[PDB]
């Protein structure tokens, strides 16, 4: 495929989310919307807030329709309360369509909006099963497909810079692409490998093996999907079930033991800094997650580098050091393949064929010695057994 119009239509970074420009209402009100594959509600700030430079003003939209229904959405971190309605929505650097979609006008929120993020709403791209108040609230993408003939799939290339970006840089730089209704070959290298969406609620997948520098973590595979395993562009970190997280950290610490870091670093509580240009990437291991393939008894793996799991953060401390935060953390709600992981790959959410594709991203951060990878196939048995019920 080739959709130059939508190439480079995203802005943002892993720590604050990636967003796309949208317009809502009549006349059009331009708003930046966070792209969230871990939720299913389309919502926008609709009242003043310290972190919003603009918000949706329903009284100024002639096409706004009040559904007279309240709505509440809680997330792993953050939540908001709002009022449901519908209005006309367009995506300036997306397909040239206009759709009437459900919209949650956010009236109250806690730790949802983020200072300096530059986004004012969220686009839940997952399935109706998890939409609030319930699955009768049709998600944005479902309405787009029903009302237009846009192919039922979208792809994401989230681009991490590999270094900290200040406010102006995040505004003036391209954070990636969201190709709606297609796949753009200029966004990846090598071939696409697909894993099946286990169930249409979150974008759920099954991990069947984990390696740290080629060494098998060797845990019962059900543990890797303990509870569930999802792909979520709205989550910064690679998050792992508590037992997997402990085993993974023990193994990464052992591979990097030539240098010692405070416990707080491994808990994502503090940063580690190295003098300008001397980050010892080579001492950190690559991490491979093997995913169930589309072919029976077949799997493939995606491998990420420390350039993906060590998130660049500025050192307000005045210096030219390169600093980072450990971007893998524990979860009590299953595995979350967050932005840190998606930054290494072009990810195709093929809803039509109920599968998620991965290819090496043409914008992933790496060094001259190692690159992220997507490789297959591997003969793996009894994989369905890795799923938790």
């Amino acid at each position: 495929g080739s959709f130059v119009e939508m190439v480079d239509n995203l802005r943002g970074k892993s720590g604050q989310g990636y967003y796309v420009e949208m317009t809502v209402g009549s006349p059009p009100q331009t708003l930046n919307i966070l792209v969230d594959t871990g939720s299913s509600n389309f919502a926008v700030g609709a009242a003043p807030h310290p972190f919003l430079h603009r918000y949706y003003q329903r009284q100024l939209s002639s096409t706004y329709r009040d559904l007279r229904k309240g709505v509440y959405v809680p997330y792993t971190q953050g939540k908001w309360e709002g009022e449901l309605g519908t209005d006309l929505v367009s995506i300036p650097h997306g397909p040239n369509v206009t759709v009437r979609a459900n919209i949650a006008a956010i009236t109250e929120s806690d730790k949802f909006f983020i200072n300096g993020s530059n986004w004012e709403g969220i686009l839940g791209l997952a399935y109706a099963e998890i939409a609030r108040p319930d699955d009768s609230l049709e998600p944005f993408f479902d309405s787009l497909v029903k009302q237009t003939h846009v192919p039922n799939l979208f792809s994401l290339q989230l681009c991490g810079a590999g270094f900290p970006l200040n406010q102006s840089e995040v505004l003036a730089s391209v954070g990636g692409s969201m190709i709606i209704g297609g796949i753009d070959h200029s966004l990846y290298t090598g071939s696409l490998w697909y894993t099946p969406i286990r169930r249409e609620w979150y974008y759920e997948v099954i991990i069947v093996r984990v390696e740290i520098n080629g060494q098998d973590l060797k845990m019962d595979c059900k543990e890797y999907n303990y509870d569930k395993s999802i792909v979520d562009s709205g989550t910064t970190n690679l998050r792992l079930p508590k037992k997997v997280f402990e085993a993974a950290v023990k193994s990464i610490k052992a591979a990097s033991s030539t240098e010692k870091f405070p416990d707080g670093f491994w808990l994502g509580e503090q940063l580690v800094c190295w003098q300008a240009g001397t980050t010892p990437w080579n001492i950190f291991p690559v991490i491979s997650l093997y995913l169930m393939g589309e072919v029976t008894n077949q799997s493939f793996r995606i491998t990420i580098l420390p350039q993906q799991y060590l998130r660049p953060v500025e050192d307000v401390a005045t210096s030219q050091d390169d600093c980072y935060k450990f971007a893998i953390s524990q979860s009590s709600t299953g595995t979350v393949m967050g932005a840190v992981i998606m930054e290494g790959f072009y990810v195709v959410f093929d809803r039509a064929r109920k599968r998620i594709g991965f290819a090496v991203s043409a914008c992933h951060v790496h060094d001259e010695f190692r690159t992220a990878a997507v490789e297959g196939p591997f003969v793996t048995l009894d994989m369905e057994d890795c799923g938790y019920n």
Binding site: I114, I130, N237, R239
Partner: peptide, 10 residues
């Protein structure tokens, strides 16, 4: 200063 997003509970 490092922000972090962790977007639904079900």
């Amino acid at each position: 200063w490092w922000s972090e997003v962790n977007x639904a509970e079900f």
